[PDB]
Amino acid sequence: ARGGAKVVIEPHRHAGVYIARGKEDLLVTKNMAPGESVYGEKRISVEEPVPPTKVEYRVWNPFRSKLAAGIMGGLDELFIAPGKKVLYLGAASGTSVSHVSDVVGPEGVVYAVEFSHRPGRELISMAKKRPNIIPIIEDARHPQKYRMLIGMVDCVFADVAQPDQARIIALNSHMFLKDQGGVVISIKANCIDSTVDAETVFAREVQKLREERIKPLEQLTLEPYERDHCIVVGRYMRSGLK
Amino acid sequence: SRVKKRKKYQKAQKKLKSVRAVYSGGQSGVYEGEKTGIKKGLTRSVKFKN
Amino acid sequence: VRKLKHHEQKLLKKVDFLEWKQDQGHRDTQVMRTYHIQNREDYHKYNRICGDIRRLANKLSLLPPTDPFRRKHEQLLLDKLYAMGVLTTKSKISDLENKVTVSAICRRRLPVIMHRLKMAETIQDAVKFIEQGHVRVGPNLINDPAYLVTRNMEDYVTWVDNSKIKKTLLRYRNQIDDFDFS
Amino acid sequence: LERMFAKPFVGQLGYGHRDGVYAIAKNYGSLNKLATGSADGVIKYWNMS
Amino acid sequence: AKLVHDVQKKQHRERSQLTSRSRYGFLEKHKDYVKRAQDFHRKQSTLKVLREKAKERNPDEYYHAMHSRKTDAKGLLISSRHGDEEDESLSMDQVKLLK
Amino acid sequence: HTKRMQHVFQVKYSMDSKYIISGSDDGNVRLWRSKAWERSNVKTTREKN
Amino acid sequence: QNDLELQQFLRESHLLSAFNNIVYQDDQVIGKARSRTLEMRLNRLSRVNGHQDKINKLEKVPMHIRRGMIDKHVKRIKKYEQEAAEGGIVLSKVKKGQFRKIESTYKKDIERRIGGSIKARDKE
């Protein structure tokens, strides 16, 4: 926790991520560009043996991420892995897309998509320091508009706040997502529908996914971290949903 | 009469934290960590039966 | 033989190269494995004997119930088999039909008896020691592992007196006495 | 094998009509298009892709 | 409860050891006696088992471990306090190294 | 035939001579193959032969 | 109607006459007749106070084998009844479901592999 404590890193169930055991346990991803924390979080450092080097790990804050909240609540399957291609819709900045890039590692790639231009500038600077990311500063409801930059991505993550979430996911996933490909949605009930209740919103959006040919595998609510939020993991089928 | 109902309500709120996982605001201090431990082998997510 | 596909399986539902239906569950080879016997003919000689006992039991059953002849002969049969050792209870004539089995005869065989009396540690060990000639029944040594030892000779299986097995057994207990040249 | 493979039903169009389909006309030029009219009175132009 | 006063649920206390027998300390009640008899019967049960095994030993049993185990000439077993099979005693080369 | 199909009133082919469209009194428009054992796949020359 | 020696003889008359090749007493009955009569009595009591499926399960026979046996037997029953009714002879009354019982079934013991009737149609 503090500035000098010593912890034991350990592989989690999902590959790519790690647990730092101590008097309190910390979710951790291996830092790609070592020596600079992106959003000011503390970070662990080990030394490994030619002369040895200093490898660095980075803490994952779930009161800021909405994917480490899913990891900590416990998702059985997350389709992000140490070698894949991830399309990140709604990538505000490094505060989650950098952790996803450290998870997919130097082999895989991550295409971050944002609309507004001040988070665009943040994304451009962080992506300059980190080579797995390619940034797009364009509206995410127009895969035809950015079709020359993406080829056959392997999973999609969605942190979109707009109330057309299921249609924009369906467009991008028909265009680019591979068959039998992981879809991960973070639903915010208050953004999607404010009058009716959160459970009604959740059933409604899982219905929209099943209509747009994504078979939902599981659904977590991530309660001690955020309120009225949900994570839906599904698999893009395209052939025999039954 | 309402003191019993007040004490039953707060007793039930403690039982609710024991059963479910409730929203305690968020972090306001610096994130010190999960004070109770991370588990690997458990999956508290509702699996969609087909 | 290739884990053939679905339509191949539906067209060949009934083929099997390893297990046919005359190899009646491979019961013979399974019992030969359990009690470590040396030939197929031995299992099926025992099966012929059990078949003869069972047809005699069926005919005595078909005789009328309160028949002195029936009671006399079924009692002679149960007494004979219990004295031999094959069946364990002298009281049930539906045991005389039901529980007479090749495994019952095959475990009155000799290395099973040694292994049960704890002369040996496995039945393969008992077969090896018999073949190397350490075991005597009575005063004369037995070299055949397929010896059917009854109850009243299970009272007489011993080690042959000049064996390194007997020397080691006594020497472990610290009781060797070479006056006998044990 | 043709007995084992014979599976003719493919699907239905939409949720269907509401009273019973009595008239059907296929577009003689194009391939996906047909028009079905019920006894309710409602007629529908249908994509079959 | 049902139809019982508290004075009916009184809690009678218990008496201690008589004063002139303070040498022979702590007068024993039924709970202490039942502990005693339970433990004595456990010990007697395992002793009856071991004596029936000693009766039905069958002195022709040969297990292969008789070439590694050794039995004391008085009658008990002996056992290496070292755990292994090899560390009974060194050889001259490793004595040279260790010196 | 199928249990849910009452009283077929209108039936057509498809314009590629492969499927059959049947509208029935039930209120449903169903679509079948013309040869059941076929599939609408495309086939390598080895399988096609 | 309550004397049970006579009623047992009347029920077992068919098996006695089938394995004749008259001994009806329990002491002097012998062989397959003894086996089948004892099985019949035990079946009667168990039927009066037991569950119908566990009482009367049949024996396993493959599908085309049992269907061929059923059709052969049904043809012999149709021939026998047509012969009687043609050259007029009264026959014992069978129910509408079940089969007739003939000396063919008493010799061959076919009611262990076929049964009383066809329970799928009887259930319909």
Added chain:
Amino acid sequence: DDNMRREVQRDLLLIKHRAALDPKRHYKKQRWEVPERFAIGTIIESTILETLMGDEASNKYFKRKYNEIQEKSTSGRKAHYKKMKEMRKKR
């Protein structure tokens, strides 16, 4: 490998038994067997055993609780029986 086993094994044992180091801090019940591969690093903003035994309040708590447990077991066992025999043999 089997290097630095003293400090590393003591730290691993401490983390495995971390639910006894603090009275007001308890954990989810997990059975944490020692992992195959791990690394030991610091946090950028000694060892855990020596900082733990350098803390004072935790040390006093360990002393108090150890003395309590040991007085319980030693009160139960033998020495009592020697006291009883001596109390009889005295007079």
Added chain:
Amino acid sequence: VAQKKYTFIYDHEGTELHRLKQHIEARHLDFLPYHYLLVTAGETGWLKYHDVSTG
């Protein structure tokens, strides 16, 4: 292989798979290879065809 009384069927490694209780006393073996039929002709004056895929 044909043996003293019974024909035996062995694997590619000598693992005995079957013994044929019905093929008594054979001296001549053969195999019709499209029909998958083992033909055994013996000293009993009998001639037996045994389908080896079904058993």
Added chain:
Amino acid sequence: GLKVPKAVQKELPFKSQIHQMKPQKKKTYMAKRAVVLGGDEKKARSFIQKVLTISKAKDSKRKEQKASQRKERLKKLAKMEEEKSQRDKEKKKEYFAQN
């Protein structure tokens, strides 16, 4: 702890023999030789045995608390089973007015 007589222990069969180690008298060379560390490794070992003892005591007390709760739950469960059984008997005996 119990003791077996030497005659029993001397006639026990091979498999069920008791292993007994005598407290060694002389000083062996390795025990004369091997060195132990002073002060700080000493405090390390003391601290570790303190932690392990506290953990064992806490685990035993929690386990015994939960065992008592299990006994309470068993008794309540048995009373609920009694009620269920009687209500089923009255349901069936009532049902056979319709049959």
Added chain:
Amino acid sequence: TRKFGLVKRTLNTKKDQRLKKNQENTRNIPQVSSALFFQYNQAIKPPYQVLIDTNFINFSIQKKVDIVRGMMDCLLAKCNPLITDCVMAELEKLGPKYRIALKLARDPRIKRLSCSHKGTYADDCLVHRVLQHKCYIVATNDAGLKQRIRKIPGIPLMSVGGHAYVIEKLPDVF
């Protein structure tokens, strides 16, 4: 130098890799619903959503209550009734006698929501939707379905009895 206790080499039916019967040889404790008090389900509020079953349709025809009218009269709020695809297929499979009940069910205010499974078992589909979501109140008259949905904690039940409808586990009917 040659070995003892030999024996002819055969098949192991208890251990072989080729034999067909012998050939084949992260817990999930689901969180309780975040929208549930101890037994209350505080996230059902007007307007309500209600799954329909075939027995409910049939008995509503036989006792003459229009679906939306009687459902509004029961709950006193507005009700969105939903037919699932397996329920509609159960009705169509019932067929020519119950076709008037099918034609009542094909109504432009009965929003049909699709289901993704094989078969047409409405009991399993409805029980799984209810177990996953906790936002629908169920409407049926089947005894087995009533018992499963009673055992599910926090899902209100609704049948048809006498003339009007009857709900069971909604804490605010009045």
Added chain:
RNA sequence: AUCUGUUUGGUGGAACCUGAUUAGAGGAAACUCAAAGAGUGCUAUGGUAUG
């Protein structure tokens, strides 16, 4: 200390009980030989052959 005797870690596992297995089990070697699964790679290309 010819002091007492507890906790922690190593060694050894008897009596009863519960499972699982049983021609007792463990290990090695490898450009050895043999069956059999799971995946990956390959323009893997005559909708009717070469005008």
